[model samples]
Target chain A: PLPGSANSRLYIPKTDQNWVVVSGVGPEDIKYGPGWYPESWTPEGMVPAARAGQPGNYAVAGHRVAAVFWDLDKLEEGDELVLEDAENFYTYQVVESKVVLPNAIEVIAPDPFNPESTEEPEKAYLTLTTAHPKLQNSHRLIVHAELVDTRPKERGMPDNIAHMAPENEEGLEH
Target chain B: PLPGSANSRLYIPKTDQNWVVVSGVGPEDIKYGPGWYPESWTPEGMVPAARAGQPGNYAVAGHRVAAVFWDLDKLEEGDELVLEDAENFYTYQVVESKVVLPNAIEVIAPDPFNPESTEEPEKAYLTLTTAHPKLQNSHRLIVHAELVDTRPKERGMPDNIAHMAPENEEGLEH
Candidate 1:
C-alpha cells in the first residue's frame, strides 16, 4: 500500500541521461526508445524526464505488454537503470517499486506523491511507470530510481549495455 | 469556446516528417527535441501522439511561456510545421488554431471532442499546445496542422529547416 503524502523521499539525479536503458525491460538495444516518455505536456498532462538537470521528477510511462516495458515488473532494488542520449550515461539505482491507482499523479511530483502539496520540487527524481499487470488498465506499476553515477560516453558502455550499442561502440562487437 | 462532444474534426497528417520543427518558439535547433511527447498512460492521463499511425489526434502540450513553447501563440494557419526523427521529414500546413480551457481532452480525440463517439479515425493529424496567454493557466492555446507532404531524408532538409540541422549533416559545411 502507498503511504499518504510526505512519507517518501525524492532524489534528484544529474541531468546526464537522455535515453533510458534498463536490462529488465526488454532487448538492450530496443528495450525502450525516447518515444516511451512524454517529451513535453503540450500542457495536456506531464513533463518527461526532469529537464536534464532541473529539480522535480523525470517521469515516464509505457504499456505493460507492448513492444516495450512489458517486463518492467522484473526490475528489482539496486538494479541499474541507465539514461543516455548520444554523449553521456546517467545511471540510477532502483530504490523502490509499487502499484498505485490510475490517478496517482503525485508519484511524478517534484517532491513526492501528495494530495495537498503546493511546493516546487527542490530535488531531482526519476519515475518509470506502466499499467499494472500485462494487458490491463486497472492500476499503475511504478518504479523509482535514484541517480548514482554519471559517466561520459567515452568511458564506454557498461557490461549489461553491450547489446544496446553498435558493434564498434560497446567494445563487445564480435 | 470548446464544443461539448463529437463535433470537432480529427485531422491526420501523413507520416512524412519524423522530427517536429518550429520557429519563434526557442532556439530553432534546441527549441524542440523528440523527447517532448506523451507515449502512454499509467491510467494517470493521456497517451502520446495518437498511437503512432492509427487514427485519432496526435496531440501534444507544452508550457505556454516556457523556453520551448513560449511563442506557441505565434503560429498561424498556413504555417509550415515540421516533424522529423533520424529517418524522414514530415511537413504540415497549419490548418487551425484556437484557445480552450484546460479540460479539452476531446481536441485530441479521433472524431473530435465527443463523449459518445467510437469511430476509428482514418486520417492523420498533428496538434501543438501551450498555455493560452502565457504565464496564466486560464486556457489552452492550440495549433492544428495537416500533413501536407512527407519526404525522405535522402531528399535533403527543407528550406525552412536549414538552421535546425547541424551544418555538417545539412550538407552545408564548407
Candidate 2:
C-alpha cells in the first residue's frame, strides 16, 4: 500500500494538549486522521510541510472551514508551535504570519516572502497554511514559525497535554 | 530525512522513453524526479500525477515556463496521456481541459470540475495543472484525462521516447 513493502512512515500528531499546541486556535485545531498524509498526498487534498528535521520550508495545507485548520486565522505573531516525536519535543515561535494569494508559493520558500532570492538556507523552517476567511477561498492564511528549543522526549509531555503520542502504534513500523 | 528512520518515497519517472507521454504539449514533456512531493515544494516544484495503476486521480502541478509543463496550454481535447510503471503501460484520453482560479482545487478531484458532488466514480482521472499565462500567476491551466486502455510495459516505449525507467534501483523498494 505504501510504495512496495515499505513500512508506514506516517507521522500522526497528538492533539490532547500543546503537543502541537497553537494558541488562540480552537479545540478543533488540527486534524491528522485518514486525510492527513505527512508529506503531500494530492489524492487526500492535505499537503503537509517537510518533516521536523528536513531542510527547506516545512509547509502544511488544509481546508479552512472543514474539520482541520478552521481557526488558523486566530494564530498571531509570537504564538508558540510545539511538536513532539518519540525521541524529543521541538518548539518553534511564530515569526511571520499573513495571507497570500494561492500563487504565493514563495511564502513556503526557505526564505519566506522573498521569491526572487535563491540562497540555500541554514535552518529548518515551519509553515502552517490554510484557506483564508473561513469559507472564503480568496487567499491563503499562512503562519511561519522558527525553531527555538528542543527537549528530550524523556522530558515528559508538555504541560496541559495528554497522550502526546497516538494510540500505541506498537509492532507497526511507524 | 523522510520522517524518522523513514526513507524517501520519491517517485522518479523514467525519461529514456515516453514512459509517460502527453501529446500536443511539447518536445520536452513532464519528467518526474525525486522531488515531486505532491503539495507545494517550491524547490523541485514539478510534482506528477499518481502512479500509472492507482485508482484515483493522477494529478500533476508545475510552472508554466519551467523545464516541464511549459506548453501545457497547447494541449486540446482528445489528446492522449500515456504513463508506465515497471510492468504495464497506461493510456488516458484528454476529455476536457481548461483554466480556472487557483482556488479551484476541484480541478484535480476524482470528478474533475465538480468538487461538491460526492459520486463514487468508476474510471481513473488525470489532471495537469500549472500557473496560468506563462509567467503570470493570476490563474491555473488545468487538463483532464480519462483512462482509455492499458498495455504491457514491454510494448516498446512511445515514438521518439528514450528510457522508460530511471536506471533501475534494485533493492530500493521503488
Candidate 3:
C-alpha cells in the first residue's frame, strides 16, 4: 500500500517489496518519489494498456536509486513482478531485458520496436525502465514481463511475496 | 572565471556565460555542479585532447539545466565558441551538431562515430554535450567545433565574447 494508505501496492519478489505504485503523475515526479506515469494510467503512444491482468501493457519507470530501482536490473527471465489491488494479486513473469536510449519511446509500443504498428497485445504485460550500466544513466535498462497468474486477495498474499505484505493488511477484509 | 574564481574561463557567446567548467570528476557529478570528466582533463577513448587551441578533441559535458547547456542546441554551423586561458584566447567555429546516446562515448572521438580507430586527430576541436530535448534526459545533444583562431591574451578578448570577460580579468596579467 502507498506509504500510509490502504491502496495500490506493487512488489518484485526477486528485487524489493516495499515499493508503492502510483499513477496520474509525470515521468519526472519519480525523482521525488517512486510513481507510475503518463497521468491517469491512460495508455500513450499506440499501445493499449489496462489494469493488471488485462490484455495490454502496464509500463512503470523509476530512477536507478537504492530505495527503488536499485536492484531492478538484477531481475531475470521467469522472475515474478507482482501487483496487488483490493481484489487480487497479479503476477507477471519476466520475459526479457534490453538496453535502450531514452529517446526510444517506442519501447512503450505493444511491439516495443515498432511504434507504427497498430496490433494489440495478446496478453497482459509489464515494461519497466531504469538507468542502465549499473550506477549510470547513459542508457535505460528495460525489462518485459507477461502476466502468468491472478489470485484473489482473499487467498492471502502470494507465498513468494507474503513477507512483504503489511502486517495490518492481513486483518482488513477489503 | 568560475562563479568567483580568479582564473581559467571559457565562453560560448551563443549560450550562457556563467556556467563553470570543472574537471577531475565523474560524469554524474553534474547533478551537483557542471563539470568535465573521465578525470584530470586527460584524454579518454583514444582521442587526443589538450588545452585550448592545441591539436585534439577537447570534450566537455554538463547538464541541461536552465543555467547551462539550455540554449546549447541553439548553436548552429559556423557559430563561434571562444575559450580563454591566462595566456591566450582560442576561438573555435561550430562544425556540426549530433544527437547521440550517452553510451556513445565515442562521440568524444576525433571521429565521434568511430571509436576503434587509433588514428590521431589532424586539428584542434571542441565537443560538448548536454541532455537532449527541451525538458528531457533521454539522449545527449552534442556540438562539435574546430579551432579557427588563437591570439595572445594581450589581444584584449575577441570582440564577440568581450562582454563576457570578467572585470577583474581585464587588468590582470598571467
The number of the candidate with the highest TM-score is 3
The digit string of per-residue lDDT tens for model 1 on A58-170 reads 66554455455567787788877765544556677878889888666667655454424455556655677777767777778888877677677698766566445332333
Among these predictions, the greatest DockQ belongs to 1
Every model's DockQ: 0.04, 0.03, 0.01
lDDT of 3 by residue, A90-146 (tens): 899999888887666666565444446556656677777777778766788888888
Instruction: TM-score for candidate 2, please give it.
Output: 0.42
Q: Total clashing residue pairs per candidate?
A: 37, 5, 0
Estimate, for each residue in B118-150, the C-alpha lDDT of model 3 and write its tens digit: 666568777787777768766788888988988
Off by over 4 Å in 1: A1-174, B1-48, B51-54, B113-116, B167-174
Per-candidate TM vs. native? 0.41, 0.42, 0.44
How do all the candidates rank in terms of TM-score, highest first?
3, 2, 1
For model 3, give the RMSD to the true fold: 17.9
Global lDDT of each model?
A: 0.48, 0.48, 0.61
**CA-RMSD of model 1:** 16.2
Best by lDDT: 3
Poorly placed runs, candidate 3 (over 4 Å): A1-7, A24-28, A39-48, A111-115, A167-174, B1-174
DockQ of 2: 0.03
